Design a protein around this ligand. Structure first.
Ligand SMILES: *[C@@H](O)[C@H](C[C@@H]1CC=NC1=O)NC(=O)[C@H](CC(C)C)NC(=O)OC[C@H]1C[C@@H]1CC1CCCCC1
Ligand SMILES: *[C@@H](O)[C@H](C[C@@H]1CC=NC1=O)NC(=O)[C@H](CC(C)C)NC(=O)OC[C@H]1C[C@@H]1CC1CCCCC1
Lengths: 303, 303
């Protein structure tokens, strides 16, 4: 049996119209064009002979307006350049006539968002990730993908949340929000950086366990219950996030008649072992599906 | 460690511009607008009091040109209507000025393609599936999603391959190619239909095992080998597809220096059990990644 759950990305058309190629002469990557502004990673200024110990303050001052070349696949003339954290804020003489209604917002661990992977300013693929507890993502990026963006949708509004920056030693990825900061303690310098331990997203595992009940799978549901407090205390010594309920999870407890605490108890049992059984055709806990994904794809309820 | 493999969909912008709402007065679903043609499922003609034993020949003849209402979110006037298998071929007075360069092609088991799930003609999400051996897909569709399309991309050309039709008893899905036929032995009637047994896609499991080597995981690679012939004979009594090599798999054997047959041997071993070990963080064989996905996402090689 199939759960009816796939990794669902938002449609990318609105964002595709906002991608440009930006280059300083050394590195080439992608930028986000909205109104008279183009956002892109700041290591576009870096020479390849300094990606490990660059001084962006000094590189920026060495830049003038015509040090930046912005192209769409037209040519946009840069009339103003500024640095905000790990991003550049270039100003162009032409506003993107296809600019969507948009906002900038930070994504939190567990939540999902859609990524548009681009190269040379040309969109090449879209996928969806969940922000990991250690503020990385398990994406699919190669060289020249920096500036590829990540976004959630609320109605006709694009909430931009992620501009790709770099890959870590373990194959995962991370980038900056559009306020300038990197997620987690990372720095956009090509050196060894300590990575924090990842954790199972407790809320997303509950959403998954609910998704299994909505498909007729509920062998794990025992009448026993574990309080959120007792679960969170347990979660800290077991590499689980701490659980925080929502209306989206509450709606999933109403439809199934299964209490959140019954499933918290279930997660404690399953963590020690599935006892050879399968859940949605899996023998390990899944935490890459949000309550919203389950509500949307299975119950048809967007909120 | 992370494999750098995600379920990568093509960007959907070109297809979004080709989606319309079509209705006959009873059911509402989605249609594909290309040039002066709009394709949509034929059960849009069905009254809800006959989805189980409809006569489409009789329903079609009961239809005239103004029985069909096509909308984009303009209004397209229908000037010609015809039925091809399980699809309708409506002709409208206006050609889609955003028509991409496109072809119609049938997808084969194991291969992947990108789906644009739409509702009321409004694109709502995109994902990617692999055509299962039993000619179903493990998608995410609800009511009103019929007409949602599935497509592969070769350069700047959209190869359309799937128009969604229905869901089966087990939660999986299937639809028609744009020649009119349904994939597999299915019929677009809302009755019980025998479903064939699914199988592991041998080629996609090899691609996955290669993907694991490209990430430093190769505990399963033993010098032992199994010939394709011996593997295919084994596959028929074990619910595996029969393996057929390609330049894309050959390229993956060249990069890793691991022979295809070594991995065929490995699949026979792993099928009996992983012995408690993990492959790319999994304890079951993965067959939802194609050799092309691995070549593209990990080696950066599109072909
Ligand atoms: C975009 O230009 C690119 C994206 C990378 C390249 C391949 N996959 C990706 O996700 N970003 C970078 O190259 C940045 C540039 C710096 C100025 C920030 N750096 C990297 O991502 O470099 C690759 C990182 C992983 C290797 C360094 C490694 C880390 C552990 C310690 C040993 C060295
Ligand atoms: C699009 O209109 C819709 C898509 C379905 C609805 C929910 N998820 C989907 O993928 N398609 C249909 O409703 C078609 C219409 C017929 C005229 C072909 N039929 C269905 O998909 O009906 C749902 C199927 C599964 C239930 C019937 C079930 C099958 C096993 C035997 C008992 C009855």
């Amino acid at each position: 049996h199939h759960s009816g759950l796939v990794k669902m990305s938002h449609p990318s058309g609105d964002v595709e119209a906002c991608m440009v190629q930006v280059t300083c002469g050394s590195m080439t990557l992608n930028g986000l064009w909205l109104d008279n502004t183009v956002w892109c990673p700041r290591h576009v200024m870096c020479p390849a002979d300094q990606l490990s110990d660059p001084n962006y303050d000094a590189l920026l001052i060495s830049m003038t307006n015509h040090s930046f070349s912005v192209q769409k696949h037209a040519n946009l003339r840069v009339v103003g350049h500024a640095m905000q954290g790990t991003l550049l804020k270039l100003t162009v003489d032409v506003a993107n006539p296809s600019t969507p209604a948009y906002t900038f917002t930070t994504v939190k661990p567990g939540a999902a968002f859609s990524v548009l992977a681009c190269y040379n300013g040309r969109p090449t693929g879209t996928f969806t990730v969940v922000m990991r507890p250690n503020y990385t993502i398990k994406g699919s990026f190669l060289c020249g993908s920096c500036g590829s963006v990540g976004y959630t949708k609320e109605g006709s509004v694009i909430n931009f949340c992620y501009m790709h920056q770099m890959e870590l030693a373990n194959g995962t990825h991370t980038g900056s929000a559009f306020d300038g900061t990197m997620y987690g303690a990372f720095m956009d310098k090509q050196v060894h950086q300590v990575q924090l331990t990842d954790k199972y997203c407790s809320v997303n595992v509950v959403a998954w366990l609910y998704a299994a009940i909505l498909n007729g799978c509920a062998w794990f549901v025992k009448p026993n219950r574990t309080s959120v407090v007792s679960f969170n205390e347990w979660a800290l010594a077991n590499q689980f996030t701490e659980f925080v309920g929502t209306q989206s999870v509450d709606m999933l407890a109403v439809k199934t008649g299964v209490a959140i605490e019954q499933l918290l108890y279930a997660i404690q049992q399953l963590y020690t072992g599935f006892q050879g059984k399968q859940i949605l055709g899996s023998t390990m806990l899944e935490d890459e599906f949000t309550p919203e994904d389950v509500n949307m794809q299975i119950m048809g309820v967007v909120m």
